[PDB]
Design a protein around this ligand. Structure first.
Ligand SMILES: *[C@@H](c1c(COP(=O)(O)O)cnc(C)c1O)[C@H]1CCC(C(=O)O)=CC1=N
Ligand SMILES: Cc1ncc(COP(=O)(O)O)c(C=O)c1O
Ligand SMILES: N=C1C=C(C(=O)O)CCC1
Lengths: 402, 402
């Protein structure tokens, strides 16, 4: 069963909603992936930062294998013995009263929108269905109809019917535009990524998160931090907002919340927001099931016990320092925090980001481009310095071979 | 850690978006659940029909255990070796060209709306963003902003900001209403449940689905069948639409697609619909991951090998026949197909459906009310006749005890 057979089988029986890098993995462990021919690659995508803990981490695997024999799903129509233990752990770890469990990142994002609107009408006193939520251009938080209604990427929203009203969009990294938008008293919330992931690891200016927090507080607007990709040690802190000591009203977690073993997402906020949703008013079949909760407890324990936030911080400085040694004729910019980084490519007639990742793949490193001239570098946080430096030499020789 | 401690911990650290039946489970096997005091119960909810195969089915457990050691998540930015195998299996099983993999049921629903709209514009030629989707009153398909915009239940949508435009609502089980609504040439699709689940197991008249299929075909409108709860043997057929031999344009599968071991959902349709979505225009991080694919193959194999569909059909007939022996002015109606059934309570204020379920629990059977006078009975399809008859006498004893 060859890589080419794998490509063709999906081409016939699967939807064409993705254009993947031509590589066919069958095994993964830590920072490494193997294709069906047995080739080894460095994973520098981490499945969009979902395997921060590395592929098939034994503690998370053990948690899954232990729980799957006892009980995997009662639905939240009944109680089980695991959900509450996870809820107490995650709320005390991040210091919010309550967590609302969901499965995927979009669902957490949708939950936060519902919380923001419900808070807007029942607490702030906005007249019903005039509540607005402000988003930042370049934002990506999934592909439901509501999520693409806030996007500024035509590939995401074009052709997908009329869009959800009440979503305003302002430039990213722009405190005066935020203040202008918050003059409207019908605004209920501002949702923003501390670093925009799918936009190309767009790091805002120092002080932006402090300005957002101040502006949101000044105008009584919920600050929703989407940490589904930047959180859980990826940028060198528990949350990327920690860099500016900023406390959002709602935090969104996901992806790495399970080490890649189970779709688990979470919405954290205090009682005055969380309890605006009453029994019967929100839910999810698989949300908060005991199997995903066991996995998530183990995945959080891994990040803490192995000190992955500090490892990501320390190794991320090395990565960016070395990447900045590449000549400015070929690499125009290097940006990121911790182990979430990107380079900007001098796009010409000779090459683009897809061609570089094709050659990076040939040299044993898997990375994906974000839109034509940008390459993301996001390896699992369990990578060690020597593995990192070997990775860098692969990136150096690949980039300079064009 | 008692049952009361578990209730109290979740009350403190978990959102209050549910009010569950007060029972705290810690083990499940087949048709049975055990609570933390060791009491044994019949499961007559099956986690909203997600454990058709019974709790912790060993073949599905083994598939999960086998795959988690190899590879659990690459994202669809790369290929893995499992997805295409699952895609070929599920598309040939249901005889559609392609499948689009998602995680939760509402994600499958959102995918179908996006397919319907993009097909409406690019194939049918509706002017952009005039495309409409018709729903039936009483429909439930999740709690995203778009899912609740189609809902007629105020508890689902009240307070949740402005709603998605382009959604129309007609009565269920009403062919003249559908015919009137399909006079609008901007309708792209009609989405309907073959049996409405959360509305209270509302079974439409014989011939409704044939008339839906004919009317949709007559007016060039996509027939989207939501089989997330009714499918996969629950009603006594592979799909509830099989009872009338109708072939929808889009089939939604979920819940039991994994036996409750992983959030897996699927959207099935032919190339002319599926291929309206181009690479980069839809996706999800965990959609199509190798772990969920493996358990979904095993879950579908269980339904076939153990012939659960014909077991559900045969035992459902016994269940409804016995329940109709209860006094007519205490149990006012019995309805359902296969092992998706419900009874309607002669609700006074000396009792309601919630009180009956509390006493059902006291007598060893776990069920949930859906409307105050309706109780759903949906045990796993691996239930045997003698186990079902003991369950019936629990119900008989409970109902006749008031
Ligand atoms: C399940 C349901 C869905 C929702 O799927 P999911 O997002 O996985 O919960 C979609 N379509 C149908 C026919 C269906 O029955 C239910 C039942 C549970 C539930 C909840 O707890 O929120 C709501 C649903 N719509
Ligand atoms: C920041 C951010 N938010 C939300 C999402 C959506 O997550 P999911 O694909 O699990 O729905 C992603 C991925 C993401 O990177
Ligand atoms: N916003 C996101 C979208 C993704 C997808 O749909 O694949 C992955 C990254 C998170």
């Amino acid at each position: 069963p060859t890589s080419d057979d794998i490509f063709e089988r999906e081409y016939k029986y699967g939807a064409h909603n993705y254009h993947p890098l031509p590589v066919a993995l069958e095994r993964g462990k830590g920072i490494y992936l193997w294709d069906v021919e047995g080739r080894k690659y460095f994973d520098f995508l981490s499945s969009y930062s979902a395997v921060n803990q590395g592929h098939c981490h034994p503690k998370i695997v053990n948690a899954l294998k232990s729980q799957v024999d006892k009980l995997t799903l009662t639905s939240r129509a009944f109680y089980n013995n695991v959900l509450g233990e996870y809820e107490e752990y995650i709320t005390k770890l991040f210091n919010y009263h309550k967590v609302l469990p969901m499965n995927t990142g979009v669902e957490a994002g949708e939950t936060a929108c519902k919380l923001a609107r419900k808070w807007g009408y029942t607490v702030k006193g906005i007249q019903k269905y005039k509540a607005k939520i402000v988003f930042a251009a370049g934002n990506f938080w999934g592909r439901t109809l509501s999520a693409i209604s806030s996007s500024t990427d035509p590939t995401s929203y074009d052709g997908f019917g009329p869009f959800m009203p009440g979503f305003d969009i302002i430039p990213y990294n722009d405190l005066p535009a935020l203040e202008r938008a918050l003059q409207d008293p019908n605004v209920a919330a501002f949702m923003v990524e501390p670093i925009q992931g799918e936009a190309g690891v767009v790091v805002p200016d120092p002080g932006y998160l402090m300005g957002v927090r101040e502006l949101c507080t000044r105008h009584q607007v919920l600050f929703i931090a989407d940490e589904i990709q930047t959180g859980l040690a990826r940028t060198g802190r528990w949350l990327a907002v920690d860099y500016e000591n900023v406390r959002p009203d709602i935090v969104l977690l996901g992806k790495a919340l399970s080490g890649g073993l189970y779709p688990v997402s979470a919405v954290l906020c205090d009682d005055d927001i969380m309890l605006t949703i009453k029994p019967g008013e929100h839910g999810s079949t698989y949300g908060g099931n005991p199997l995903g909760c066991r996995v998530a407890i183990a995945a959080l324990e891994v990040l803490e016990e192995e000190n992955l936030a500090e490892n990501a911080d320390k190794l991320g400085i090395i990565l960016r320092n070395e990447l900045m040694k590449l000549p400015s004729d070929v690499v125009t910019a290097v940006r990121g925090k911790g182990l979430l980084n990107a380079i900007v490519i001098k796009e010409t007639k000779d090459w683009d980001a897809w061609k570089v990742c094709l050659r990076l793949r040939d040299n044993g490193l898997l990375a994906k481009p974000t839109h034509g001239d940008i390459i993301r570098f996001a390896p699992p946080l369990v990578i060690k310095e020597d593995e990192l430096r070997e990775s860098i030499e692969i990136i150096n020789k690949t980039i300079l071979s064009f």
